[PDB]
Amino acid sequence: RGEMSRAINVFKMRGSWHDKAIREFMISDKGPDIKDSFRNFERIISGSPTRITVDEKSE
Amino acid sequence: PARIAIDSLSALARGVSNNAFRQFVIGVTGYAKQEEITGLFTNTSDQFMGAHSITDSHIATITDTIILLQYVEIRGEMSRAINVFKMRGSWHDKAIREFMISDKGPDIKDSFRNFERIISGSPTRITVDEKSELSRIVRGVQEKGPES
Amino acid sequence: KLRGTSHMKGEYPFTITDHGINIFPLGAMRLTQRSSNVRVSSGVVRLDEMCGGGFFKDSIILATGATGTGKTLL
Amino acid sequence: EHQAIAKMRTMIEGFDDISHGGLPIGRSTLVSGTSGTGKTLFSIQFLYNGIIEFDEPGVFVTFEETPQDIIKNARSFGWDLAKLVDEGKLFILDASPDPEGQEVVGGFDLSALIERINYAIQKYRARRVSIDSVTSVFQQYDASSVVRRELFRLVARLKQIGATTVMTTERIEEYGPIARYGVEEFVSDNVVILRNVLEGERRRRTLEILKLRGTSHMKGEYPFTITDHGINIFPLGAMRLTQRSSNVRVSSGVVRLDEMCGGGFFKDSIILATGATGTGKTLLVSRFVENACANKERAILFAYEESRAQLLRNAYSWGMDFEEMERQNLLKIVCAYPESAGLEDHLQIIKSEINDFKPARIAIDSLSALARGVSNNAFRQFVIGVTGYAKQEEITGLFTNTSDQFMGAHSITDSHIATITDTIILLQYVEIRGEMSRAINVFKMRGSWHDKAIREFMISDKGPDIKDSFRNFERIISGSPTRITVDEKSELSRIVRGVQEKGPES
Ligand SMILES: Nc1ncnc2c1ncn2[C@@H]1O[C@H](COP(=O)(O)OP(=O)(O)OP(=O)(O)O)[C@@H](O)[C@H]1O
Ligand SMILES: Nc1ncnc2c1ncn2[C@@H]1O[C@H](COP(=O)(O)OP(=O)(O)OP(=O)(O)O)[C@@H](O)[C@H]1O
Ligand SMILES: Nc1ncnc2c1ncn2[C@@H]1O[C@H](COP(=O)(O)OP(=O)(O)OP(=O)(O)O)[C@@H](O)[C@H]1O
Ligand SMILES: [Mg+2]
Ligand SMILES: [Mg+2]
Ligand SMILES: [Mg+2]
Ligand SMILES: [Mg+2]
Ligand SMILES: [Mg+2]
Ligand SMILES: [Mg+2]
């Protein structure tokens, strides 16, 4: 929506299992605040997303 | 040995020329084909997602069977996928199947069938009224059958 | 040059080891690689089906993919 | 022939063309070159043929090598010089110093040698003369000044006599000064440089005619090979463009494809099969070779990727038994590594087998296999070679090119050879529904009309199955196509309910 938002992700860890989602986060005076993923978007990695706004199953 | 594996030849190509490498491959490839040895070579394609080539220095062809893993972005998540690209003497599965990674190993689930442009890492979800056609409401031609 | 006869032309890498000079005629080795229809597992069941039975014993299997995909695993 | 300088033939596979005829009669040609380059053979080869082809006795002066050895060595190419030095056709004139020699002797002896050689030439009635390693004579205590005068005397007198002479010169650097005393180059009438350039740990020898006072000739380097038969040159550029073309048609071994090509490949035509790794190329080629033998015609297969054994395993699995093919003496499999020699050689190995077997068809699986390491021009020039040879010989060719980038390769050349080729066959993957399906296409056919669809094909134990086209898909070539449907359910065989039978009975 016209705003440079972030996104943290644990790309690879040889031992552990790590999270496979791309979670956005933000920076305040309290430090980083990881948030929720972009479940509803597409091409996320590319950088310039593309919401899917799928019309449900159309009833 | 009866089996031989070198993890990350892409770890050898470090600095060394392209030709010196290519040669080295043949050197470890041929010697393995003659000595009745089964070999698996690990290669790390410099770029995750989008990779138009599956090697680096173009070793590809000097091989029998290709096994490919590629990151697929889905619903805001980075999930793997595998595919047997080419097998010179066998049949091998054409489909591209995704897979989990736990404490047990690899579980080759299904294939993103309701998807497009997968090889790009970032696919295009395209269910939007699946193979049932606009006839999900069966028109109404089926209003003759049940009577009294 | 080897006056009178023939020879392999060019450079060839050799390694002076604890067993004297050892030259690898990387070009000499011929392309006479015995083959057969024998297959062997991988350690991944389904995967073996995906090949159609298992990798051939006499072959070279290539595993590519981005860092993290899990080639070391396979 | 329009030239004003009379020439005599060396009968050296290649030279007489590059020299537009052969060494200028009554003159001296300086064939110079690095250590082991080819020099002294040329010389010997030059006297040889004159003997065994024109019956012209020759005089060979040795300076460093022992008159015994020259004969001992020349046996490698299969020549009993002995017998000739014996029948009075070849007079070897020793001048090699001695194992218990003094020091100082290269000026008045240079005057004596003239008279010497002048005796044997008058005696044996010779036409050709070789003076191998003059250099060694000055390697006693001399400098540029005394070498141009002394050589000159020798050649000057030699020309007066009427002998067509060849002198040999050594040189430390491959491209730098032509000869040691950087003076021989202007004292001679002609100058034949022989090199053996390194680069990429491999070795490439070439011959070049810098100058031929009086006539024209082919300029620049030309690769040659020293085989069991001696010097062998390739005027890759003297290869005129006047091959024969015919509307005759042959099979591809794949029926449906044939249609797709207007009615079967042209007899005289180069064929290119490009497609990402694992697309199929190797197969087709095998099905091409096969059929050629199924009609009783010869054909060769030069595998640079897969072994002769494996070529059969996968060949049998696809049906078609190569075991028999070999036995019925109809198909010959070469099979080798592109790293086991320089192209010059590889180009000749192929040519050879094409003359000791006379194929009527040929297939080179993975030209791109030969493009490894090598420079594009070097490889492009080699392609023109094979392509060249097979074209002027009515031998149908099917080359295999594997593009370095599956799905998304904006160019099926990579090395840009698609314009020398007559007919291209394209194989490429197609991402349809989480599945890597294949699909072939006939890009171009110079004489035929060929089908313009990008049909899909499947591989079975039986072979290449050419199905139907992805009409309802855009961005095909892109590799991962976009499904846009105007139909699909459109007739073809609607009729719902029970349409099939099963395995019991129909
Ligand atoms: N115990 C585990 N549980 C869940 N996931 C794991 C576990 N171990 C590893 N993984 C996952 O598998 C990946 C490990 O990669 P792996 O060791 O298979 O080699 P690779 O991908 O071929 O090469 P490299 O490790 O150098 O990137 C990690 O990135 C991670 O996502
Ligand atoms: N039968 C043969 N097959 C292949 N190569 C051969 C054969 N016989 C000789 N050669 C090659 O020929 C070359 C010998 O060179 P040659 O005797 O023609 O004179 P030169 O190289 O000009 O001068 P010099 O006496 O200083 O070496 C070597 O490089 C050698 O490998
Ligand atoms: N018996 C078989 N049954 C089914 N499919 C086969 C069989 N043999 C080979 N294949 C298929 O054919 C392909 C093998 O490629 P092929 O040997 O035709 O040469 P290529 O693709 O031109 O070059 P290269 O194999 O060196 O990459 C594989 O990708 C595989 O899917
Ligand atoms: Mg291949
Ligand atoms: Mg890695
Ligand atoms: Mg690793
Ligand atoms: Mg020498
Ligand atoms: Mg010599
Ligand atoms: Mg192949």
GROMACS .gro file of N, CA, C and O in nm, chain B residues 18-19 22-23 26 29-30 33 51-54 57-58 60-64 66 68 83-97 111-120 126 131 133, chain D residues 201-202 276-279 281-282 305-307 310 313-314 317-318 337 339 366 368 371-374 402 404-409 429 431-438 459 473 475 480-483 488-489:
model
  392
   77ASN      N    1   3.728  -2.188  -1.422
   77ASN     CA    2   3.609  -2.260  -1.462
   77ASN      C    3   3.651  -2.389  -1.531
   77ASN      O    4   3.589  -2.494  -1.510
   78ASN      N    5   3.755  -2.379  -1.613
   78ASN     CA    6   3.804  -2.496  -1.685
   78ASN      C    7   3.871  -2.596  -1.589
   78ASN      O    8   3.848  -2.717  -1.598
   81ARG      N    9   3.572  -2.776  -1.435
   81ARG     CA   10   3.515  -2.868  -1.532
   81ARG      C   11   3.596  -2.996  -1.545
   81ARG      O   12   3.541  -3.107  -1.542
   82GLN      N   13   3.727  -2.980  -1.558
   82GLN     CA   14   3.818  -3.093  -1.571
   82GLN      C   15   3.806  -3.179  -1.445
   82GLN      O   16   3.780  -3.299  -1.454
   85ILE      N   17   3.509  -3.417  -1.441
   85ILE     CA   18   3.534  -3.534  -1.524
   85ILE      C   19   3.630  -3.628  -1.449
   85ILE      O   20   3.612  -3.750  -1.444
   88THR      N   21   3.434  -3.788  -1.198
   88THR     CA   22   3.316  -3.848  -1.259
   88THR      C   23   3.350  -3.978  -1.329
   88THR      O   24   3.291  -4.083  -1.302
   89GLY      N   25   3.446  -3.971  -1.421
   89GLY     CA   26   3.487  -4.089  -1.495
   89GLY      C   27   3.537  -4.199  -1.403
   89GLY      O   28   3.489  -4.312  -1.410
   92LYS      N   29   3.266  -4.381  -1.264
   92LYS     CA   30   3.187  -4.459  -1.358
   92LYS      C   31   3.257  -4.590  -1.394
   92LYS      O   32   3.192  -4.690  -1.424
  110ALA      N   33   1.648  -1.928  -1.024
  110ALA     CA   34   1.760  -1.994  -1.091
  110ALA      C   35   1.723  -2.061  -1.224
  110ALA      O   36   1.654  -2.164  -1.227
  111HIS      N   37   1.770  -2.001  -1.333
  111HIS     CA   38   1.745  -2.050  -1.470
  111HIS      C   39   1.840  -2.162  -1.511
  111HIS      O   40   1.825  -2.221  -1.618
  112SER      N   41   1.939  -2.189  -1.428
  112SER     CA   42   2.037  -2.292  -1.455
  112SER      C   43   2.059  -2.370  -1.325
  112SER      O   44   2.062  -2.311  -1.217
  113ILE      N   45   2.074  -2.501  -1.335
  113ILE     CA   46   2.091  -2.584  -1.217
  113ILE      C   47   2.232  -2.640  -1.190
  113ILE      O   48   2.247  -2.760  -1.168
  116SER      N   49   2.889  -2.376  -1.336
  116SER     CA   50   2.981  -2.383  -1.450
  116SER      C   51   2.937  -2.470  -1.569
  116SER      O   52   3.016  -2.495  -1.661
  117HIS      N   53   2.811  -2.514  -1.566
  117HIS     CA   54   2.752  -2.597  -1.672
  117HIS      C   55   2.797  -2.744  -1.675
  117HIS      O   56   2.818  -2.802  -1.783
  119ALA      N   57   2.614  -2.989  -1.560
  119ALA     CA   58   2.490  -3.056  -1.598
  119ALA      C   59   2.498  -3.182  -1.682
  119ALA      O   60   2.481  -3.292  -1.632
  120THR      N   61   2.523  -3.161  -1.811
  120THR     CA   62   2.531  -3.264  -1.914
  120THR      C   63   2.624  -3.385  -1.879
  120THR      O   64   2.590  -3.500  -1.908
  121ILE      N   65   2.736  -3.361  -1.811
  121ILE     CA   66   2.830  -3.467  -1.774
  121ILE      C   67   2.771  -3.552  -1.661
  121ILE      O   68   2.844  -3.603  -1.575
  122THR      N   69   2.640  -3.569  -1.661
  122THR     CA   70   2.575  -3.645  -1.556
  122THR      C   71   2.462  -3.731  -1.608
  122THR      O   72   2.409  -3.706  -1.716
  123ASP      N   73   2.423  -3.830  -1.529
  123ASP     CA   74   2.316  -3.922  -1.567
  123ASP      C   75   2.177  -3.881  -1.521
  123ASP      O   76   2.084  -3.868  -1.601
  125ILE      N   77   1.947  -3.609  -1.267
  125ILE     CA   78   1.937  -3.482  -1.197
  125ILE      C   79   1.825  -3.483  -1.090
  125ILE      O   80   1.713  -3.527  -1.117
  127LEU      N   81   1.646  -3.217  -0.823
  127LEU     CA   82   1.637  -3.074  -0.796
  127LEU      C   83   1.547  -3.024  -0.680
  127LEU      O   84   1.432  -3.063  -0.668
  142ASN      N   85   1.227  -3.235  -0.745
  142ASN     CA   86   1.190  -3.288  -0.875
  142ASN      C   87   1.306  -3.359  -0.942
  142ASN      O   88   1.420  -3.313  -0.939
  143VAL      N   89   1.274  -3.473  -1.003
  143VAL     CA   90   1.372  -3.551  -1.074
  143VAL      C   91   1.365  -3.495  -1.214
  143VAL      O   92   1.274  -3.524  -1.290
  144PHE      N   93   1.461  -3.410  -1.246
  144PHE     CA   94   1.468  -3.344  -1.376
  144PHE      C   95   1.488  -3.438  -1.493
  144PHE      O   96   1.404  -3.444  -1.583
  145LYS      N   97   1.600  -3.510  -1.494
  145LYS     CA   98   1.627  -3.603  -1.603
  145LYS      C   99   1.695  -3.730  -1.557
  145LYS      O  100   1.779  -3.729  -1.467
  146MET      N  101   1.656  -3.839  -1.622
  146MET     CA  102   1.711  -3.972  -1.598
  146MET      C  103   1.735  -4.030  -1.735
  146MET      O  104   1.640  -4.049  -1.812
  147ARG      N  105   1.861  -4.058  -1.766
  147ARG     CA  106   1.897  -4.110  -1.897
  147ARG      C  107   1.845  -4.249  -1.930
  147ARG      O  108   1.816  -4.278  -2.046
  148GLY      N  109   1.830  -4.334  -1.829
  148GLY     CA  110   1.783  -4.468  -1.858
  148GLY      C  111   1.650  -4.513  -1.799
  148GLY      O  112   1.595  -4.615  -1.840
  149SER      N  113   1.598  -4.437  -1.703
  149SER     CA  114   1.472  -4.473  -1.638
  149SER      C  115   1.353  -4.385  -1.677
  149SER      O  116   1.357  -4.309  -1.773
  150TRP      N  117   1.245  -4.397  -1.600
  150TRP     CA  118   1.124  -4.321  -1.624
  150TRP      C  119   1.120  -4.190  -1.543
  150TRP      O  120   1.099  -4.082  -1.597
  151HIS      N  121   1.141  -4.202  -1.412
  151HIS     CA  122   1.139  -4.087  -1.322
  151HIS      C  123   1.014  -3.997  -1.330
  151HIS      O  124   0.962  -3.966  -1.438
  152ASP      N  125   0.967  -3.955  -1.213
  152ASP     CA  126   0.849  -3.872  -1.198
  152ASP      C  127   0.863  -3.729  -1.245
  152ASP      O  128   0.948  -3.653  -1.196
  153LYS      N  129   0.777  -3.693  -1.340
  153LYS     CA  130   0.772  -3.560  -1.400
  153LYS      C  131   0.727  -3.451  -1.301
  153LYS      O  132   0.784  -3.342  -1.298
  154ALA      N  133   0.625  -3.481  -1.222
  154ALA     CA  134   0.571  -3.387  -1.124
  154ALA      C  135   0.672  -3.318  -1.033
  154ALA      O  136   0.784  -3.366  -1.013
  155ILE      N  137   0.632  -3.204  -0.979
  155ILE     CA  138   0.714  -3.129  -0.886
  155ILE      C  139   0.644  -3.142  -0.752
  155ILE      O  140   0.536  -3.087  -0.733
  156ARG      N  141   0.703  -3.215  -0.659
  156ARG     CA  142   0.643  -3.238  -0.527
  156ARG      C  143   0.708  -3.160  -0.414
  156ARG      O  144   0.829  -3.146  -0.408
  170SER      N  145   0.218  -3.239  -0.524
  170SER     CA  146   0.264  -3.136  -0.617
  170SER      C  147   0.169  -3.016  -0.625
  170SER      O  148   0.047  -3.033  -0.626
  171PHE      N  149   0.224  -2.895  -0.631
  171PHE     CA  150   0.142  -2.775  -0.642
  171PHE      C  151   0.075  -2.785  -0.778
  171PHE      O  152   0.129  -2.738  -0.879
  172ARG      N  153  -0.041  -2.848  -0.779
  172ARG     CA  154  -0.118  -2.870  -0.901
  172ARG      C  155  -0.206  -2.750  -0.938
  172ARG      O  156  -0.229  -2.721  -1.055
  173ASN      N  157  -0.256  -2.681  -0.836
  173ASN     CA  158  -0.340  -2.566  -0.857
  173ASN      C  159  -0.251  -2.443  -0.859
  173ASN      O  160  -0.289  -2.337  -0.810
  174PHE      N  161  -0.132  -2.458  -0.916
  174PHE     CA  162  -0.039  -2.346  -0.922
  174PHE      C  163   0.024  -2.328  -1.060
  174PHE      O  164   0.016  -2.415  -1.147
  175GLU      N  165   0.087  -2.211  -1.079
  175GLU     CA  166   0.155  -2.174  -1.202
  175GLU      C  167   0.288  -2.108  -1.170
  175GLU      O  168   0.311  -2.061  -1.058
  176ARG      N  169   0.375  -2.102  -1.269
  176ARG     CA  170   0.507  -2.043  -1.252
  176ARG      C  171   0.567  -2.084  -1.119
  176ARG      O  172   0.596  -1.999  -1.036
  177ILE      N  173   0.585  -2.214  -1.099
  177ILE     CA  174   0.644  -2.262  -0.974
  177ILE      C  175   0.796  -2.246  -0.980
  177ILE      O  176   0.858  -2.190  -0.888
  178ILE      N  177   0.855  -2.293  -1.089
  178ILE     CA  178   1.000  -2.286  -1.111
  178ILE      C  179   1.057  -2.147  -1.079
  178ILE      O  180   1.178  -2.129  -1.072
  179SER      N  181   0.969  -2.048  -1.059
  179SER     CA  182   1.013  -1.912  -1.030
  179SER      C  183   1.027  -1.887  -0.879
  179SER      O  184   1.074  -1.780  -0.838
  185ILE      N  185  -0.387  -2.021  -0.837
  185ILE     CA  186  -0.492  -2.005  -0.935
  185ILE      C  187  -0.606  -2.107  -0.929
  185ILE      O  188  -0.637  -2.174  -1.028
  190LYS      N  189  -1.159  -2.690  -1.150
  190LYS     CA  190  -1.204  -2.771  -1.264
  190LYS      C  191  -1.352  -2.809  -1.274
  190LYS      O  192  -1.390  -2.884  -1.364
  192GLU      N  193  -1.586  -2.603  -1.342
  192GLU     CA  194  -1.645  -2.509  -1.438
  192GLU      C  195  -1.755  -2.420  -1.379
  192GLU      O  196  -1.791  -2.435  -1.262
  482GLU      N  197   4.642  -2.525  -2.134
  482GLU     CA  198   4.723  -2.647  -2.121
  482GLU      C  199   4.718  -2.744  -2.239
  482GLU      O  200   4.783  -2.847  -2.233
  483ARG      N  201   4.643  -2.712  -2.344
  483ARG     CA  202   4.635  -2.800  -2.460
  483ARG      C  203   4.738  -2.752  -2.559
  483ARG      O  204   4.809  -2.657  -2.532
  557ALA      N  205   1.718  -2.791  -2.354
  557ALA     CA  206   1.780  -2.796  -2.222
  557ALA      C  207   1.825  -2.939  -2.188
  557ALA      O  208   1.788  -3.035  -2.256
  558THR      N  209   1.906  -2.952  -2.084
  558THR     CA  210   1.952  -3.083  -2.043
  558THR      C  211   1.828  -3.168  -2.020
  558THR      O  212   1.721  -3.115  -1.992
  559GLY      N  213   1.841  -3.299  -2.036
  559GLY     CA  214   1.728  -3.389  -2.013
  559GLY      C  215   1.600  -3.375  -2.096
  559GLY      O  216   1.497  -3.434  -2.060
  560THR      N  217   1.604  -3.300  -2.205
  560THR     CA  218   1.486  -3.281  -2.290
  560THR      C  219   1.462  -3.397  -2.387
  560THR      O  220   1.348  -3.427  -2.420
  562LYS      N  221   1.714  -3.472  -2.685
  562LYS     CA  222   1.812  -3.471  -2.794
  562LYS      C  223   1.883  -3.603  -2.818
  562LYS      O  224   1.872  -3.659  -2.927
  563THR      N  225   1.954  -3.654  -2.718
  563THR     CA  226   2.029  -3.780  -2.733
  563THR      C  227   1.945  -3.889  -2.797
  563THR      O  228   1.992  -3.960  -2.885
  586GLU      N  229   2.960  -3.730  -2.453
  586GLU     CA  230   2.908  -3.721  -2.316
  586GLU      C  231   2.888  -3.857  -2.249
  586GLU      O  232   2.929  -3.878  -2.134
  587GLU      N  233   2.825  -3.950  -2.321
  587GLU     CA  234   2.799  -4.083  -2.268
  587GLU      C  235   2.885  -4.194  -2.325
  587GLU      O  236   2.918  -4.193  -2.444
  588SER      N  237   2.915  -4.292  -2.241
  588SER     CA  238   2.998  -4.404  -2.281
  588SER      C  239   2.934  -4.490  -2.389
  588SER      O  240   2.815  -4.485  -2.412
  591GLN      N  241   2.693  -4.733  -2.198
  591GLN     CA  242   2.572  -4.664  -2.158
  591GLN      C  243   2.491  -4.618  -2.279
  591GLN      O  244   2.369  -4.615  -2.275
  594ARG      N  245   2.279  -4.901  -2.327
  594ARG     CA  246   2.184  -4.930  -2.220
  594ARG      C  247   2.057  -4.848  -2.236
  594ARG      O  248   1.947  -4.901  -2.236
  595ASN      N  249   2.076  -4.717  -2.248
  595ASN     CA  250   1.965  -4.625  -2.265
  595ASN      C  251   1.910  -4.639  -2.406
  595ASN      O  252   1.793  -4.611  -2.430
  598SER      N  253   1.693  -4.957  -2.381
  598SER     CA  254   1.575  -4.924  -2.302
  598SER      C  255   1.474  -4.848  -2.387
  598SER      O  256   1.353  -4.860  -2.366
  599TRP      N  257   1.523  -4.770  -2.483
  599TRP     CA  258   1.435  -4.694  -2.573
  599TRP      C  259   1.397  -4.784  -2.689
  599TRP      O  260   1.339  -4.737  -2.787
  618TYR      N  261   3.606  -3.808  -2.525
  618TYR     CA  262   3.601  -3.686  -2.446
  618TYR      C  263   3.656  -3.567  -2.526
  618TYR      O  264   3.756  -3.578  -2.596
  620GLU      N  265   3.793  -3.323  -2.403
  620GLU     CA  266   3.913  -3.283  -2.329
  620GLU      C  267   4.034  -3.372  -2.363
  620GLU      O  268   4.146  -3.345  -2.318
  647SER      N  269   2.586  -3.354  -2.891
  647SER     CA  270   2.635  -3.246  -2.807
  647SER      C  271   2.755  -3.175  -2.866
  647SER      O  272   2.869  -3.203  -2.831
  649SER      N  273   2.783  -2.868  -2.827
  649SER     CA  274   2.812  -2.788  -2.707
  649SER      C  275   2.905  -2.864  -2.610
  649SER      O  276   2.959  -2.805  -2.515
  652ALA      N  277   3.231  -2.746  -2.717
  652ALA     CA  278   3.252  -2.605  -2.694
  652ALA      C  279   3.304  -2.576  -2.553
  652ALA      O  280   3.310  -2.461  -2.510
  653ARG      N  281   3.341  -2.682  -2.481
  653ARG     CA  282   3.392  -2.670  -2.345
  653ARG      C  283   3.531  -2.606  -2.344
  653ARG      O  284   3.617  -2.646  -2.422
  654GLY      N  285   3.552  -2.509  -2.255
  654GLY     CA  286   3.680  -2.441  -2.247
  654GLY      C  287   3.706  -2.352  -2.369
  654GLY      O  288   3.707  -2.228  -2.358
  655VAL      N  289   3.727  -2.416  -2.484
  655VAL     CA  290   3.752  -2.348  -2.611
  655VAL      C  291   3.683  -2.213  -2.629
  655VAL      O  292   3.580  -2.184  -2.568
  683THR      N  293   2.294  -2.845  -2.640
  683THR     CA  294   2.225  -2.837  -2.512
  683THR      C  295   2.241  -2.697  -2.451
  683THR      O  296   2.350  -2.658  -2.411
  685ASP      N  297   2.246  -2.396  -2.192
  685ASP     CA  298   2.281  -2.387  -2.051
  685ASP      C  299   2.174  -2.338  -1.957
  685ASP      O  300   2.199  -2.327  -1.837
  686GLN      N  301   2.056  -2.305  -2.008
  686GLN     CA  302   1.950  -2.263  -1.918
  686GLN      C  303   1.812  -2.312  -1.958
  686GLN      O  304   1.748  -2.262  -2.051
  687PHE      N  305   1.767  -2.414  -1.885
  687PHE     CA  306   1.638  -2.478  -1.904
  687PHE      C  307   1.527  -2.378  -1.880
  687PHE      O  308   1.534  -2.298  -1.787
  688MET      N  309   1.423  -2.381  -1.963
  688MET     CA  310   1.310  -2.291  -1.946
  688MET      C  311   1.351  -2.146  -1.923
  688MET      O  312   1.383  -2.107  -1.810
  689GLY      N  313   1.349  -2.066  -2.029
  689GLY     CA  314   1.386  -1.927  -2.015
  689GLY      C  315   1.509  -1.887  -2.095
  689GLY      O  316   1.561  -1.776  -2.078
  690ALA      N  317   1.557  -1.978  -2.181
  690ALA     CA  318   1.674  -1.951  -2.264
  690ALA      C  319   1.628  -1.875  -2.389
  690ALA      O  320   1.567  -1.933  -2.479
  710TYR      N  321   1.123  -2.799  -2.200
  710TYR     CA  322   1.028  -2.836  -2.096
  710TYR      C  323   0.914  -2.736  -2.091
  710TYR      O  324   0.927  -2.624  -2.141
  712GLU      N  325   0.622  -2.614  -1.794
  712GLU     CA  326   0.565  -2.629  -1.660
  712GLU      C  327   0.413  -2.626  -1.662
  712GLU      O  328   0.353  -2.518  -1.662
  713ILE      N  329   0.349  -2.743  -1.665
  713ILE     CA  330   0.202  -2.748  -1.664
  713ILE      C  331   0.144  -2.820  -1.545
  713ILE      O  332   0.141  -2.943  -1.542
  714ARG      N  333   0.097  -2.743  -1.447
  714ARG     CA  334   0.034  -2.799  -1.328
  714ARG      C  335   0.128  -2.876  -1.235
  714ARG      O  336   0.102  -2.992  -1.202
  715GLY      N  337   0.235  -2.811  -1.190
  715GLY     CA  338   0.329  -2.877  -1.102
  715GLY      C  339   0.396  -2.996  -1.168
  715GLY      O  340   0.443  -3.088  -1.101
  716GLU      N  341   0.401  -2.995  -1.301
  716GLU     CA  342   0.463  -3.103  -1.376
  716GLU      C  343   0.554  -3.060  -1.489
  716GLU      O  344   0.519  -2.972  -1.568
  717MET      N  345   0.670  -3.123  -1.497
  717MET     CA  346   0.767  -3.093  -1.600
  717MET      C  347   0.737  -3.170  -1.728
  717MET      O  348   0.795  -3.276  -1.751
  718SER      N  349   0.648  -3.120  -1.813
  718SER     CA  350   0.621  -3.193  -1.936
  718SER      C  351   0.713  -3.143  -2.047
  718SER      O  352   0.766  -3.033  -2.040
  719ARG      N  353   0.730  -3.225  -2.150
  719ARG     CA  354   0.815  -3.190  -2.263
  719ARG      C  355   0.732  -3.145  -2.382
  719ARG      O  356   0.609  -3.153  -2.380
  740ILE      N  357   0.808  -3.956  -2.351
  740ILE     CA  358   0.904  -4.065  -2.367
  740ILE      C  359   0.857  -4.193  -2.299
  740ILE      O  360   0.821  -4.193  -2.181
  754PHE      N  361  -0.271  -2.204  -2.404
  754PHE     CA  362  -0.168  -2.162  -2.311
  754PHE      C  363  -0.088  -2.050  -2.375
  754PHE      O  364  -0.051  -2.058  -2.491
  756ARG      N  365   0.235  -1.753  -2.301
  756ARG     CA  366   0.370  -1.758  -2.244
  756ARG      C  367   0.432  -1.897  -2.242
  756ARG      O  368   0.508  -1.931  -2.151
  761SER      N  369   0.700  -2.164  -1.801
  761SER     CA  370   0.591  -2.180  -1.708
  761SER      C  371   0.472  -2.103  -1.763
  761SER      O  372   0.450  -1.988  -1.726
  762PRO      N  373   0.393  -2.170  -1.847
  762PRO     CA  374   0.282  -2.108  -1.922
  762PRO      C  375   0.158  -2.064  -1.841
  762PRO      O  376   0.139  -2.104  -1.726
  763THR      N  377   0.078  -1.980  -1.905
  763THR     CA  378  -0.040  -1.919  -1.845
  763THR      C  379  -0.164  -1.977  -1.912
  763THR      O  380  -0.182  -1.965  -2.033
  764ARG      N  381  -0.250  -2.039  -1.832
  764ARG     CA  382  -0.372  -2.101  -1.885
  764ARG      C  383  -0.488  -2.005  -1.908
  764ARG      O  384  -0.552  -1.958  -1.813
  769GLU      N  385  -1.189  -2.594  -2.431
  769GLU     CA  386  -1.115  -2.710  -2.381
  769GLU      C  387  -1.216  -2.825  -2.375
  769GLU      O  388  -1.185  -2.938  -2.415
  770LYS      N  389  -1.336  -2.794  -2.327
  770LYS     CA  390  -1.447  -2.888  -2.315
  770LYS      C  391  -1.511  -2.904  -2.453
  770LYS      O  392  -1.597  -2.990  -2.475
   0.00000   0.00000   0.00000
